[PDB]
Paper text:
Here we present high-resolution structures of the A- and B-capsids and in-situ portals of human cytomegalovirus. The portal proteins are believed to orchestrate nucleation of the procapsid through the formation of a portal–scaffold complex, which facilitates procapsid assembly. During the maturation process, the disassociated scaffold proteins are expelled as the viral DNA is pumped into the capsid through the portal located at a unique vertex of the icosahedral capsid.
The four-helix bundle extending to the vertex center is formed by pUL77 and pUL48, and is associated with the “base” protein, pUL93, via the N-terminal region of the lower pUL77 molecule. However, neither the peri-portal nor the peri-penton [name] of the A- or B-capsid comprises this featured four-helix bundle. Based on the C1 reconstruction of the [name]-binding penton vertex, we next built the atomic model for the B-capsid [name]. We found that the B-capsid [name] contains one pUL93 and two pUL77 molecules, but no pUL48 molecules. pUL93 in the B-capsid [name] is essentially identical to that of the mature virion, whereas the two pUL77 proteins are only resolved in regions associated with pUL93, spanning residues 2–42 for the upper pUL77 protein, and residues 12–63 for the lower pUL77 protein. Given that the nuclear B-capsid lacks the portal cap, which is formed by pUL77, and that the portal cap is essential to secure the packaged DNA in place, pUL48 likely offers a supportive role in portal cap formation, presumably in establishing the featured four-helix bundle with the pUL77 molecules. Overall, our results demonstrate that the formation of CVSCs can be divided into two distinct steps and that the final inclusion of pUL48 would automatically result in the formation of the portal cap, regardless of whether the DNA is packaged.
Residue numbers in the entry:
A (entry chain M): 1 to 176, 301 to 464, 468 to 591
B (entry chain g): 168 to 261, 273 to 290
C (entry chain B): 197 to 245
D (entry chain a): 246 to 470, 487 to 588
E (entry chain B): 1 to 49
F (entry chain I): 6 to 115, 129 to 133, 135 to 246, 257 to 306
G (entry chain a): 1029 to 1370
H (entry chain h): 5 to 242, 255 to 306
Write the structure that this text describes.
């Protein structure tokens, strides 16, 4: 109730510039857990048209083509495209009621007057209230328009739910003081709607006293527009998986390039009397099993995520500028100030062929050990994890850069790169660009300090 | 009198100040005056006003609703606080009247 | 006289509970004195009490 | 008590002397209610003898150079004249300190009773006369709390059960009298009260008793020391000839009820709450603290609730519904 | 923080000391406030400044 | 405390009799100094053509107030009052006081002279806002109905009070401090009216109560009965200019309570009062 | 009977009369002439006369000593009235409202109260949320508890004086001024124990992260919301960091005991409140030095209680056990002949 | 009553009681007006917490009562709580410049910039940190800048707010420099932002149709420096019909109570007014309570 | 009375035969509403046992 | 309370006890003996 009415009047206020009509929503335990609902910081949502580009960027074309350029200094396009991607999303209103409830009961406890066609007893574990405004460009509206949701926790994580507007306005347009009249008129119907992937459903409300009911828009759903909107959604999903395709063809290229005699780049004791025909055969059987279990939550996606940040590109240029310099002169070392890569955070794909349980996202802190130390892979706690002793594993290592290691058991490795040049840029950002922190309640003003406890508007306590 | 008395405190502090408050409820179409004597341990007026805002939100939304429903009528106030003095924890005796009450008559500090 | 609770004092409820405990114990224990105890030491202690 | 206290430092042989030179070794004070016990209990060691107490206070004057060094260096060296003479003279041992040459040359007798404990003579002194008709309580009526503790509802084992009291009591053989659920105590007066489980309900249903969030938060800080294809892939699980490692909850059941508390047990560091099963498990090849709840009381381990305990519990439940002879 | 030279160089007064326990045990368990235990002979008590 | 003022000039005995008639009145003082000349006495050091009223009210805030105790032939005993204890004042203002009136201090508008009015608080407040709106009207006085509004705005009705408050605009020119005061009021009104629309959105992304809803409803009623992506530094300049030009209006929005009065002498020529200041 | 077995703890404040003995000239007192200051009122004139005393100690060690000699009454009821947990944590409500209301109706507490914020908990020193009872015939009361396992072997843990945690956490046992050693002694479990040769005795009460260490330790209580005014008996046993701070040489912990570790309870109220800078009465707490507790007479059945009452003197010191019933006898007879001698 | 006593736990050496006699007629915040307090509730260190907020310190410092320090005697320090309207001497320690006839109020100690950190009474685990005694223009500027910096920082990424804060956190007054350490978003801060938004929008409703367009009429007529400076931002934003003067009187009265409620959010109560200052600016006499 | 009442602790010690306390001396002085609340209302437990 | 048994055996036991046998309180299955809190049947009658 608290955000629905306010954002309804706010979209009535801001309707002139961007014709956004409100969608009053509530979520449940199917969308997210209770712990995730207690600390949800803020919500982002994006209007993207049937052509599939955006509502923030330019109408015709963009400076977001020229697919990847495979660079380190710009490394996507620089931060201007990051500013663009920040300008795509909007920060909609947000309210959590973390307590079990019946929804129609709760609107009866408020001033809202409920009447549905038939009594649907809805009972969920908590409530979070959210309104979304989909932007009709003209007065008319396209059925193959699609939406995006982003749920942000203060750690920096995000979850993306995407769906078409066709299922949102399917039955509704076919049938079709201000705060006092809004309660008296109230709701007309309640409707649940799944996403495009059928992984989560969520309920929408429909008030009759909304200003949506008097705008008299027109609604059409042409099939060739639906045909291209899934094609634009095809490339949006495909940005994660054809990158995994780009890793696998790189392995088959360099192994044909080398000829099958691959070197060692990792510190392992070995044993000569142990057979190696058994080890080579378990390379092929397990390598396909990694492709069978590929996911967005993987090491190679986590390798890219610090690179698509705000201060990543200028710091990456600062890295090579510190390397590519002269040796310190004899006049420098006596009177210049003291001049500054000990260990790096690597991400790892651990596959195991004995039980077919593959671990995708693994933090690894690795460093050069002394006395011609090739590489040694420790945990966050110096555990020296020791999976690569066993015959049952194969492991893939990535760097914060695009350097890439496929390591056989016994620590024998294949050193290659990561090629993303086949991937375009605007789909590379919107899947996993590292978004910046925006200040809210309980946040320090200056950039980073000893942060206090979380807000945690929860149901275990009273609100106060 | 016991009906005009209230607090949000278990009434055990030493320097229990008193504060005469009055509200103006506009839930009816006429003005509804609610007079309350408010004792409190907290002495500073600003944080007491934040407490009164946190406690009396219904009168605030009724006041702004009276403003948006009758723009020809001018609103008088929303709430007025005036100090009278202070007492002790033992100075109360349940009609609850005060034995030793040092008076400090200040001024009508209003709030909206 | 066991606890100093003279005529100028107020009384907490714990104080009155201790007073009642001593009331019941000494009305039970030493109600009829000379019919029970015929030893001179306890009677002397009672009289100096 | 008298021979455990060491003697003092200030040599004062003249003051507080009795007749015939029997010096005073100490002083005992208490309330009058203890003195009426001691003096009536110790009738062969009490005399009303008079002691020659000092009559005046020990007026100690300040030297002028003491005042000069007091203004200058913020300190006083007492009897600066004797220090100054004996330093430059040569002898390094003074006759007396600054406090023994003050507090004498006045003697007045007073009749206060003494006691005699093996060449030690202690002045006994009741301190009622300073505190009668006085608003302040006695400091000698010091308050001391003790911490009592007792169990309720326990379970002695049956393989070591016994009765050391056979001739004294005899209980009828009902189940309600052969399994404890209550506990009887004593009040101020000797009246048998009763605690049971029902009276503890102002504690036992609080939400903080069921909230393991700081428990999990401190357990993780220590750290460690597809159903669709399943019906066909059941034999696919057994083609591999490897064994599965024994989990932690199964490792809580091979311990007897008397050695589960011993140090030979390993899994006690995962036994943290009666309502949950805190355990380490494997997720993303990393040991994580998996805070899972128990749902029924049967999930409690064997050493913490044995089988025969549940048999006796269901015997009590069968007794409660009038079914102790079963059909 | 304490002038330990002045404890040595000043003319002392003589008493028979009677500790309850052994004196080094009371020192090592720091019953007193300020301590200056050492061993052997120390020339620290000479540099008068 | 004690304040001694003197006169280097020569004082006539008729002027001595005139001065002792002002036995206990208020005289403003620029600094609490034990000896002082009589050129610091009163308000004659601040009178000119151009300052008018708002400079005088803004200047009497940071000055202190005394009361005359006795008059000698060459020095006047000025006694600074203290908080809490009660005193005796004289009514030099044309207003006559009643019991319980909170008294305010105000400069009088209607080669050296001694001149301040002691008005009760509501009359002072209403003539303050009357002079304010009379300065708001002061630029467009060529019309007739606003001239009738000004003529109605001159005279105030009170118990034995038919006052003619003077015209703040003179020779179609407003004095510059009243110009800044009315400009500050117009700009705080405008800046409020266009920044609350942005900041009610920039605040209700947090926990929103119903007061925010009714606030936005009131604002949309305003915006429809009348007729966002801002640069950061221009926004900072907007907010800071709002608050700093608000800050020079504290002299006009409040009322310094000075005296709380008690029982009054007959003919209302003097009154016993407490100095609550 | 449910599937655990709580043990209770309680504190019983006694009124004793302690006799004191000191050697001759054990202390020199220095006094001065009285000093007069003049405070003024309207009709009265309060004169504050001040006389200063400096009491210089004389002897080397403890030249003066005392002993707790003669009790005459108790102040607490020595009862079984359990601690109101719904006022030491007034914020924690259940997630569903209706099952919370059903629990409040099943229990004795009526409604949840809002906790005070920082400014008002500064300007008012505590809460005192519990209401003083109408008729108090027995005195004040306290009874907290620890959820234990019902296989707690009582024969070596409940008949003798013991620490109710499970691990003997007396701080004299460790080497003084060692931080890792005391934490290894009172938290770890891959090592033996003092006073019992098993690892623990109550595994839901010994280590960190039990319900005890989040229920009675003031650090994890401070991480959540609690009431600082209500006194708990477990606060002397489960405040771990105060005991680790108390690891000194033993003469210094004697000085800390007799000077700074004096607990205080307010005595004019019906419940057990913590004072606000208690200068009225400092209750000497001897159990804090030892970190144990005393066993009190508890009887499973009324028949064994009756055969305990029927016997003469010395019967309370014995400990008879039936088949499943058992009598734990007190280590010191303060129920046999305290109220007998009154 | 007024004379309260504070005892200590540690012993007193000569330097500590010397630093105490250096604090004669100082100022220390006390809670609850207790007749006897320990030295742990003395001063401000029981409530100080870095990375907790400057606003909560500025709140709860104002709620503790104030006293002066005099008459040390040994293992106790006497505090005399001042009464209303009486003339006391105050020794400042916060190095801000004082002038006569000037009002004073109390702010929590914002660190000076070199991080002098002058505890000026040494113990093991506790320091006597002193409240600042700051004149009313500087303190009102601190309050206004804290409110503005709180309002601008909503819905902003770190870079633009950092670029505005590194200028906005600095402030000068009679050749000095100050920063603000813990400016975080707090619940008291957000409820004051809510109060400011409601009151300022109520000003926006209660404007007449001539006082909204007065500045446009002056920009039509005259062209002055402050006119152009106001009109510049005003243009970046972008004959009277009926004159019933009593309605303008009522509109201005409502606008006056709303501007008082807006101004009260930054302007505190004056708690000290000076009388005369020593030229070395280490002590001055003041006539008010605490 | 009822034939199921608590024999083992109500009849062997000295108790009031009605069942509640009614001592009028653990209850506060001159407070009649607290008196009838302590003597009659069964929502408030007995103070004696 | 005053000594009231419910059967005659429990009465006859307390008329054969040694000293203070009235002051005890012993219970059978359903039969019981309420005790005696003050020896009124061995003080007034024994002095005769």
């Amino acid at each position: 109730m608290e955000t629905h009415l306010y954002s309804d009047l706010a979209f009535e206020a801001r309707f002139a510039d961007d014709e956004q009509l409100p969608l009053h929503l509530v979520l449940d335990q199917e969308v997210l857990s209770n712990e995730e609902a207690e600390t949800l910081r803020y919500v982002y949502y994006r209007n993207v048209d049937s052509a599939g580009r955006s509502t923030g960027r330019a109408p015709g074309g963009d400076e977001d083509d020229a697919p990847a350029s495979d660079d380190a200094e710009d490394a996507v396009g620089g931060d201007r495209a990051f500013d663009r991607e920040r300008r795509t999303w909007q920060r909609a209103c947000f309210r959590v009621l973390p307590r079990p409830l019946e929804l129609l009961d709760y609107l009866r406890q408020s001033g809202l007057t409920v009447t549905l066609e038939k009594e649907q007893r809805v009972r969920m574990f908590y409530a979070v209230f959210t309104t979304l405004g989909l932007r009709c460009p003209d007065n008319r509206l396209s059925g193959a328009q699609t939406l995006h949701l982003r749920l942000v926790w203060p750690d920096g994580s995000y979850r993306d739910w995407e769906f078409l507007a066709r299922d949102l306005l399917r039955e509704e347009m076919e049938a079709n003081a201000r705060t006092d009249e809004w309660k008296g008129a109230g709701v007309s119907r309640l409707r649940e709607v799944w996403d495009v992937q059928h992984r989560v459903r969520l309920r929408v409300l429909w008030y009759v006293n909304s200003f949506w009911r008097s705008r008299e828009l027109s609604y059409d759903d042409h099939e060739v527009e639906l045909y291209r909107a899934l094609d634009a959604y095809r490339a949006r999903i495909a940005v994660e998986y054809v990158l995994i395709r780009a890793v696998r063809d790189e392995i088959y290229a360099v192994l044909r390039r080398d000829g099958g005699a691959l070197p060692q780049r990792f510190a392992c004791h070995v044993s000569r009397n142990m057979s190696w025909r058994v080890v080579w055969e378990l390379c092929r059987h397990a390598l396909a099993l990694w492709m069978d279990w590929a996911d967005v939550r993987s090491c190679i996606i986590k390798a890219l995520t610090p690179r698509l940040s705000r201060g990543a590109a200028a710091a990456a240029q600062r890295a090579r500028r510190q390397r590519e310099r002269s040796a310190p002169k004899p006049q420098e070392l006596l009177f210049g100030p003291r001049n500054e890569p000990a260990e790096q955070t690597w991400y790892a794909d651990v596959v195991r062929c004995v039980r077919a349980q593959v671990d995708l996202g693994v933090e690894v802190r690795a460093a050069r050990c002394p006395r011609t130390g090739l590489w040694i892979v420790r945990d966050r706690r110096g555990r020296l994890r020791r999976w690569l002793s066993q015959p049952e594993v194969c492991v893939l290592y990535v760097t914060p850069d695009l350097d890439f290691y496929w390591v056989l058991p016994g620590g024998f490795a294949v050193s290659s790169r990561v090629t993303l040049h086949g991937l375009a840029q605007r789909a590379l950002r919107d899947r996993f660009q590292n978004f910046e922190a925006v200040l809210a309640r309980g946040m320090h003003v200056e950039a980073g300090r000893q942060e206090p406890e979380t807000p945690r508007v929860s149901g275990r306590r009273l609100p106060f | 009198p016991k009906d005009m008395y209230l607090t949000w405190e278990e009434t055990r502090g030493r320097l229990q100040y008193v504060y005469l408050i009055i509200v103006y409820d506009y839930d009816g179409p006429e003005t509804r005056p609610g007079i309350y004597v408010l004792t409190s341990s907290i002495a500073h007026w600003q944080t007491l006003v934040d407490v009164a805002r946190g406690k009396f939100a219904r009168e605030r939304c009724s006041f702004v609703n009276r403003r948006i429903t009758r723009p020809r009528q001018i609103p008088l106030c929303t709430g007025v606080i005036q100090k009278l003095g202070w007492c002790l924890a033992d100075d109360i005796h349940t009609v609850v009247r005060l034995d030793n009450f040092s008076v400090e008559l200040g001024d009508f500090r209003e709030f909206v | 006289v066991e606890n100093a609770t003279l005529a100028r004092q107020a009384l907490n409820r714990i104080q009155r509970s201790n007073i009642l405990q001593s009331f019941k114990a000494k009305m039970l224990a030493t109600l009829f004195l000379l019919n029970r105890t015929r030893d001179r030491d306890y009677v002397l202690k009672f009289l100096t009490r | 008590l008298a021979e455990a206290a060491t003697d003092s430092i200030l040599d004062n042989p003249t003051t507080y002397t009795t007749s015939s030179g029997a010096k005073i070794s100490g002083v005992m004070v208490s309330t009058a209610n203890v003195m009426q016990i001691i003096m009536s209990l110790l009738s062969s060691h009490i005399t009303k003898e008079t002691v020659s107490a000092p009559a005046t206070y020990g007026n100690f004057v300040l030297s002028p150079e003491n005042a000069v060094t007091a203004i200058s260096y913020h300190s006083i060296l007492a009897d600066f004249n004797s220090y100054k003479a004996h330093l430059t003279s040569g002898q390094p041992h003074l006759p007396n300190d600054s406090l023994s040459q003050a507090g004498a040359h006045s003697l007045t007798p007073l009749s206060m009773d003494v006691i005699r404990l093996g060449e030690k003579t202690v002045i006994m002194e009741n301190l009622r006369r300073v505190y009668k008709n006085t608003d302040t309580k006695d400091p000698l009526e010091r308050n001391v709390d003790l911490t009592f503790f007792f169990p309720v509802g326990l379970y002695l084992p049956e393989d070591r059960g016994y009765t050391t009291v056979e001739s004294k009591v005899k209980l009828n053989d009902t189940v309600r009298n052969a399994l404890p659920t209550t506990a009887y105590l004593l009040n101020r007066d000797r009246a048998v009260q009763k605690i049971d489980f029902v009276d503890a309900l102002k504690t036992l249903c609080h939400p903080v008793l069921h909230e393991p969030a700081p428990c999990l938060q401190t357990f993780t800080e220590r750290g460690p020391p597809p159903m669709g294809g399943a019906a066909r892939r059941i034999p696919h699980f057994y083609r591999v000839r490897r064994e599965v490692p024994r989990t932690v909850n199964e490792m809580k059941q091979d311990f007897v009820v008397t050695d589960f508390y011993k140090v030979g047990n390993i899994t006690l560091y995962t036994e943290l709450h009666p309502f949950f099963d805190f355990t380490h498990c494997q997720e993303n090849s990393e040991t994580v603290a998996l805070c899972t709840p128990r749902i029924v009381i049967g999930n409690l381990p064997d050493g913490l609730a044995p089988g025969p305990f549940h048999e006796l519990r269901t015997w009590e439940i069968m007794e409660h519904m009038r079914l102790r002879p079963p059909p | 923080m304490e002038n330990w030279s002045a404890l040595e160089l000043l003319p002392k007064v003589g008493i028979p000391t009677d500790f309850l326990t052994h004196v080094k045990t009371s020192a090592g368990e720091e019953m007193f406030e300020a301590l200056r235990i050492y061993y052997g002979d120390d020339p620290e008590r000479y540099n008068i400044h | 405390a004690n304040i001694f003022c003197t006169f280097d000039h020569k004082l006539s005995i008729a002027d001595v009799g005139k001065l002792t008639k002002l036995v206990a009145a208020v005289v403003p003082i620029p600094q609490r100094l034990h000896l002082i000349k009589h050129y610091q006495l009163g308000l004659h050091q601040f009178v000119d053509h151009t300052r008018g009223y708002v400079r005088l009210r803004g200047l009497l805030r940071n000055m202190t107030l005394t009361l005359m105790r006795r008059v000698e032939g060459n020095q006047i005993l000025l006694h600074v009052p203290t908080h809490g204890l009660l005193y005796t004042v004289l009514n030099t203002g044309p207003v006559t006081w009643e019991k319980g009136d909170a008294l305010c201090v105000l400069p009088p508008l209607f080669q050296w002279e001694l001149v301040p009015w002691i008005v009760p608080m509501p009359l002072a407040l209403e003539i303050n806002q009357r002079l304010l709106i009379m300065g708001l009207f002061s630029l467009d006085r060529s019309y007739e109905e606003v001239k009738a509004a000004v003529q109605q705005l001159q005279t105030i009705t009170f118990r034995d009070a038919t006052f003619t408050i003077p015209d703040p605009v003179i020779d179609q020119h407003l004095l510059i401090d009243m110009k800044t005061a009315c400009l500050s009021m117009s700009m705080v009104a405008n800046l409020a009216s266009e920044l609350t629309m942005t900041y009610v959105r920039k605040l209700a992304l947090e926990d929103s109560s119903m007061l925010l809803v009714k606030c936005q409803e009131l604002l949309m009623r305003l915006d429809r009965e009348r007729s966002q992506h801002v640069s950061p530094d221009d926004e900072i300049a907007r907010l800071s200019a709002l608050f700093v030009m608000l800050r020079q209006l504290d002299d006009l929005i409040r009322e310094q309570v000075v005296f709380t009065v008690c029982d009054v002498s007959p003919d209302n020529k003097s009154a016993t009062c407490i100095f609550k200041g | 009977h449910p599937g655990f077995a709580l043990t209770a703890v309680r504190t019983d404040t006694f009124e004793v009369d302690m006799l004191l003995y000191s050697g001759k000239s054990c202390t020199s007192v220095i006094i001065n002439n009285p000093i007069v200051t003049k405070e003024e009122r309207d009709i009265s004139t309060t004169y504050h006369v001040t006389q200063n005393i400096n009491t210089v100690d004389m002897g080397l060690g403890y030249t003066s000593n005392t002993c707790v000699a003669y009790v005459n009454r108790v102040r607490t009821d020595m009862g079984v009235r359990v601690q109101d947990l719904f006022r030491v944590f007034p914020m924690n409500v259940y997630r569903h409202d209706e099952v919370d209301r059903w629990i409040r109706h099943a229990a004795g507490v009526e409604r949840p109260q809002l906790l005070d914020t920082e400014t008002i908990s500064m300007l008012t020193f505590g809460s005192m949320s519990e209401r003083n009872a109408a008729a108090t015939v027995h005195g004040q009361k306290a009874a907290c508890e620890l959820i234990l396992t019902p296989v707690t072997m009582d024969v070596n843990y409940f008949k003798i004086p013991n620490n109710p945690r499970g691990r003997a956490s007396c701080m004299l046992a460790v080497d003084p001024y060692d931080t890792e050693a005391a934490t290894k002694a009172i938290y770890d479990h891959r090592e033996a124990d003092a006073q019992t040769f098993a690892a623990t005795h109550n595994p839901w009460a010994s280590q960190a992260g039990c319900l005890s260490d989040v229920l009675y330790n003031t650090r994890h209580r401070e991480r959540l919301g609690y009431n600082s005014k209500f006194y708990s008996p477990c606060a002397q046993y489960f405040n771990t960091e105060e005991i680790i701070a108390a690891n000194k040489t033993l003469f210094k912990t004697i000085d800390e005991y007799l000077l700074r570790a004096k607990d205080c309870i307010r005595g004019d109220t019906d419940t057990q409140y913590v004072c606000v800078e208690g200068t009225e009465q400092l209750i000497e707490n001897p159990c804090r030095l030892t970190q144990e507790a005393l066993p009190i007479l508890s009887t499973t059945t009324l028949a064994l209680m009756e055969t305990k009452l029927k016997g003469g003197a010395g019967a309370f010191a014995t400990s008879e056990t039936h088949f499943g019933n058992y009598v734990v006898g007190e280590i010191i007879p303060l129920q046999q002949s305290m109220l007998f001698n009154s």
